[PDB]
Design a protein around this nucleic acid. Structure first.
Ligand SMILES: [Mg+2]
Ligand SMILES: [Mg+2]
Ligand SMILES: [Mg+2]
Ligand SMILES: [Mg+2]
Ligand SMILES: [Mg+2]
Ligand SMILES: [Mg+2]
Ligand SMILES: [Mg+2]
Ligand SMILES: [Mg+2]
Ligand SMILES: [Mg+2]
Ligand SMILES: [Mg+2]
Ligand SMILES: [Mg+2]
Ligand SMILES: [Mg+2]
Ligand SMILES: [Mg+2]
Ligand SMILES: [Mg+2]
Ligand SMILES: [Mg+2]
Ligand SMILES: [Mg+2]
Ligand SMILES: [Mg+2]
Ligand SMILES: [Mg+2]
Ligand SMILES: [Mg+2]
Ligand SMILES: [Mg+2]
Ligand SMILES: [Mg+2]
Ligand SMILES: [Mg+2]
Ligand SMILES: [Mg+2]
Lengths: 86, 82, 62, 80, 47, 205
RNA sequence: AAUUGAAGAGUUUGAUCAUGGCUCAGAUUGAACGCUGGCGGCAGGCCUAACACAUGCAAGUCGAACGGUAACAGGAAGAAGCUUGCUUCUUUGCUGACGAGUGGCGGACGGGUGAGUAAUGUCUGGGAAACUGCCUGAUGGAGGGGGAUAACUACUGGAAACGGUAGCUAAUACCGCAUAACGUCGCAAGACCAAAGAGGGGGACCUUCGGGCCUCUUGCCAUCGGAUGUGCCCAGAUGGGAUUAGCUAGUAGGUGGGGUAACGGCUCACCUAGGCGACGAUCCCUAGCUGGUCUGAGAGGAUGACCAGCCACACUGGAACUGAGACACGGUCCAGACUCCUACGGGAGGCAGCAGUGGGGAAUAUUGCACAAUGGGCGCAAGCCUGAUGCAGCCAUGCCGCGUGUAUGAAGAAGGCCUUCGGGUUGUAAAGUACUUUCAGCGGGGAGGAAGGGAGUAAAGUUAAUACCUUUGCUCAUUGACGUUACCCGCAGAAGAAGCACCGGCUAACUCCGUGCCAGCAGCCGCGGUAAUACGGAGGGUGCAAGCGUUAAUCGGAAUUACUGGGCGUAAAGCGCACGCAGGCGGUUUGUUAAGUCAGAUGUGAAAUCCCCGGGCUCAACCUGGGAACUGCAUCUGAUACUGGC
């Protein structure tokens, strides 16, 4: 990085990246809980998982990490799956 | 953003601008959405020199178009002439 | 490729650079090129006053 | 009224997909002769309605598959 | 550079790259190296 | 840009009087106008069709003092314009400011006129014109500025003009040293020896 | 008013006509070389090595986002030699401001190059499943808590590059919680989702005298929009090769999952066995594509420098991250080859930005000045940055203009060359005489490109308020890189400003030597074997002219690939002859359809260019107004003779 700005951006990017990864990773984990529940065949549990995670997903979307559409999609798929289950 | 600006299409030492409606990011003389008129600072005292389709400009402004400072000045001048 | 040395006389010899321009000498079966006289190494022709441009001959002061 | 093309089926066997040869009658640019030109479009069809050798009216749409961006609206003259 | 690469343009004096004779000679030598009387030899053999 | 050399040689080559010398003293006495220029002038050449056309072209160019490229350009312009092409070309040639001046009678010869134009002697509509080729449009007045009115050369030119034939498309004043370009010169106004058609043909090969 | 345009020639022969090639005359260029060579204007300028790169600069900005002050200029409290009046040395962000930082926005534009790509390309036309910062229009929110973290400090690890611990602090950084629809999810009830404070001025209830409170200005956030931009799809068009005919398992399609901003074999699981293809798939070679450019009467052909649009790429090969947007020329990570530094442990680097250097090359410019404009970035601005851009330099590379004197001038001088020996030619050419001064030289004056911005004010718009802010007027001084600018004047005096090719035929222009089929010429035919208009010179001429030639390259001519526009008994050319799938074509009458066809309309075909009419540079080139044009495509509405379908 020859230009100060680039250097700043680079370090910022690194910092930003670390931040986002943590959030995104967490979100993924949350999703997996729901998915795991679905796989198991535990409906109440699945619902609980969804409840736990949906808000987080929404928050993430709001922040910008994940896109609004993407956030919606997870819910839809998850919603569909849970519905199917019971 | 979308902007109304002078595009310097002329000879050396003899500028002639088109008051074009271009995306700010595009080049000055390069791409544009619509050509709205022209302006000639050289011109001289004869008949014409500055001429802008004001209605189109207004429309663009309404939509959400940034008029350049020079362009704004030109517009003002035109208005006063009118 | 084989090339034709135009004009009378030359300073050409083996392992010497020259500028070639094309345009064949038709009575030589093989030659399709001409050496430009006055360019790079090959000197212009000695003592000519007409068509000098074609043989690299500088303009004599008179 | 949305756009639509008419042509005949070249093949059916792939489940919910029919291949349709649109025969356009373009003029040759240089020479001037009118030639028949083929456009083999892969077309989406629910319930496998068209068979092979049937004329079928088809409309453009969002790409259903890699190749398929057409969907049949009607069938016309199918028995052979 | 790490590799040796003299141009044949350096030998040509009209461009104005080498005024010295010695330098020119040296330059030439390189090309001959890269490349890698008969009558006399024959005579010698005969002798 | 101009022909710096023997004026009458060109005329001789052509055959006819090109008006390259004033006309105070006649062309037939000055040079051997009948004979072509050079050692082989008496040897009458059997001239080809292309050759004749070329000669014609030269004559016209010589008359106005228009070098080849310029002439070609003029021809092209004429072609682009509507009507008879040769006629148009002729008009354009005439329209040359220097030529116009000469016609009026401020240049004895066309060369003189050109020189005057160059030397900021001439004005068109109260504006100086350095350029000899300037196309003098209809209703454009042309004059000499007060600094160049006092020249004897101009007077001489005027006198010469008076002696000679008058153009119809021009108006001129001797005392004021100015005039008016009324309209574009027709084919009937100009000399009939100029076969413009030949010239046109030559710029179609 | 807007394509008003079309030439041949030489050469096969003893001669002819014909076929037929080669070939010249034209236009042209990003051209080069040769010989020259005054100037200007407008243009253009590494086509090859997408080869390597030293140096500088090419992207920074915002202190009105935030703690802070690394330099500086002012006050504030203290004191030194005390010129009786402050110079000076110490302290404190209190202020104008600002190093380094965090944050924001910008580094996705601008600029470059054309390596790759014959299609995740381009052009044209259609679309549907999308996102879209700033700008924008609308409708509602912006409450109340946190804990961090650089910066800064001590002790330290490293040659450096860069760290590492332990502490400290803020924010429009970050995160919960509340609040929560016009949002997201869903059949609903419901569940769930956000933020942002900052700057200028101020009456009084007030005040931990910071500020609360009011106000304006800006910023935040959600949602729907708008515009703009980007992604995606399909049709057709967009090179050559079949001496490349078979190709392809995520392959073609499906159900479901996953993924994407979005649809999609985009990817995975399982199933069906397809899909493409001689209307050329596949493989190979070459190639950015388009507007256009050149050429051409056109139709075409060639072509794609410059300018403009679209694509692709950034030392090679990857990969993601950040973000509205990139899988990012001057960001990150890795590997590679290659240069540099290193204390040998490890680092740094990426001109196809602008200059520049080397190299390659036939060949393509200066490490120039400037932000004065136009545009871009940031900011509330002032402003700062801007190798975009504007200008400047160099090169006749092009185009255009201008000049290089004008008029006169027989002794037809001299000299030159020829020479029937008279002259006749150079040639009115020169000299002489008169006259003029373009540009160049000197000295002077002297616009336009400059519109904005800054202070004071007065009014109106906001509000508790005549403050502040915004809007509109006005005077005041201002803002030029180019710049001894364009442009005008005066001075002296033709002074300083012509050369290149050609001259047998084609092909405009001819005489005179040496030699001797030698030397040389040459585009083709052909010249040269002792009297050469063809070779070299001289004169004389002809062509062009600051250029001229040569060479290369394209179209033209070449109707010589013929669509327009050719042929095939004998010149090249009828399969040896049949049958025959695909294809092409298809007698005749009525109906119908409207695909072709025709007509009209609508949208589009970017702008520039081309073309026409104009306008502006002294004219021109150049610029430029408006038009026409873009012969195309799509949709809609009709026509139904002809062609097609039924
Ligand atoms: Mg799904
Ligand atoms: Mg070289
Ligand atoms: Mg010229
Ligand atoms: Mg030179
Ligand atoms: Mg700062
Ligand atoms: Mg925030
Ligand atoms: Mg699926
Ligand atoms: Mg390539
Ligand atoms: Mg033709
Ligand atoms: Mg890459
Ligand atoms: Mg992202
Ligand atoms: Mg770079
Ligand atoms: Mg004599
Ligand atoms: Mg001057
Ligand atoms: Mg002749
Ligand atoms: Mg010759
Ligand atoms: Mg042809
Ligand atoms: Mg034939
Ligand atoms: Mg035969
Ligand atoms: Mg037969
Ligand atoms: Mg004019
Ligand atoms: Mg257009
Ligand atoms: Mg019928």
């Amino acid at each position: 990085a020859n230009i100060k700005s680039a250097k700043k951006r680079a370090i910022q990017s690194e910092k930003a990246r670390k931040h986002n990864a943590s959030r995104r990773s967490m979100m993924r984990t949350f999703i997996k809980k729901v998915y795991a529940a679905i796989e198991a065949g535990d409906k109440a549990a699945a619902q609980k998982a969804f409840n736990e995670m949906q808000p987080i997903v929404d928050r993430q979307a709001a922040k910008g990490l994940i896109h609004k559409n993407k956030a919606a999609r997870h819910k839809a798929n998850l919603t569909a799956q849970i519905n199917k289950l019971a | 953003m979308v902007t109304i600006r002078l595009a310097r299409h002329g000879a050396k030492k003899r500028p002639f601008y088109q008051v074009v409606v271009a995306d700010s990011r595009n080049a000055r003389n390069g791409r544009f959405i619509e050509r709205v008129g022209f302006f000639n600072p050289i011109a001289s005292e004869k008949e014409e020199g500055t001429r802008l389709d004001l209605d189109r400009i207004a429309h663009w402004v309404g939509q959400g178009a940034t008029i350049s400072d020079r362009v704004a000045a030109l517009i003002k001048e035109v208005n006063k002439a009118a | 490729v084989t090339s034709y040395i135009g004009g009378e006389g030359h300073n050409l010899q083996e392992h010497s650079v020259i500028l070639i321009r094309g345009g064949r000498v038709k009575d030589l079966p093989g030659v399709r090129y001409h050496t430009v006289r006055g360019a790079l190494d090959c000197s212009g022709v000695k003592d000519r006053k007409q068509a000098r441009s074609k043989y690299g001959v500088k303009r004599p002061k008179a | 009224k949305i756009r639509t093309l008419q042509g005949r089926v070249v093949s059916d066997k792939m489940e919910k997909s029919i291949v349709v040869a649109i025969e356009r009658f373009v003029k040759h640019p240089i020479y001037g002769k009118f030639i028949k030109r083929t456009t083999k479009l892969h077309v989406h069809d629910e319930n496998n309605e068209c068979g092979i050798g049937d004329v079928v009216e088809i409309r453009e749409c969002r790409p259903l598959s890699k190749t398929k961006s057409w969907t049949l609206v009607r069938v016309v003259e199918k028995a052979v | 550079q790490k590799q040796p690469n003299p141009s044949r343009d350096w030998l040509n004096p009209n461009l104005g790259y080498v005024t010295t004779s010695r330098g020119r000679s040296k330059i030439h030598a390189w090309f001959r190296k890269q490349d890698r009387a008969a009558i006399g030899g024959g005579d010698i053999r005969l002798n | 840009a101009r022909y710096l050399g023997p004026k009458l040689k060109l005329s001789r080559r052509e055959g006819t009087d090109l008006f390259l010398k004033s006309g105070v003293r006649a062309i037939d006495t000055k040079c051997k106008i009948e004979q072509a220029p050079g050692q082989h002038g008496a040897r009458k050449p059997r001239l080809s069709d292309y050759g004749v056309q070329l000669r014609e072209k030269q004559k016209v160019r010589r008359i106005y003092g228009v070098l080849e490229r310029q002439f070609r350009n003029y021809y092209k312009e004429a072609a682009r314009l509507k009507g008879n092409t040769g006629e148009n070309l002729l008009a354009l040639l005439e329209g040359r400011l220097d030529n116009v001046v000469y016609r009026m009678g401020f240049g004895a010869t066309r060369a003189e006129a050109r020189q005057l134009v160059s030397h900021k002697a001439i004005m068109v509509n109260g504006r100086v014109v350095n350029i000899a080729s300037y196309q003098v449009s209809p209703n454009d007045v042309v004059s000499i500025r007060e600094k160049a009115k006092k020249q004897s050369r101009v007077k001489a030119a005027l006198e010469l003009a008076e002696q000679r034939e008058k153009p119809t498309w021009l108006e001129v004043d001797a005392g004021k040293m100015e005039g008016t370009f009324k309209r574009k010169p027709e084919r009937s106004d100009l000399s009939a020896d100029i076969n413009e058609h030949l010239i046109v043909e030559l710029y179609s090969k």
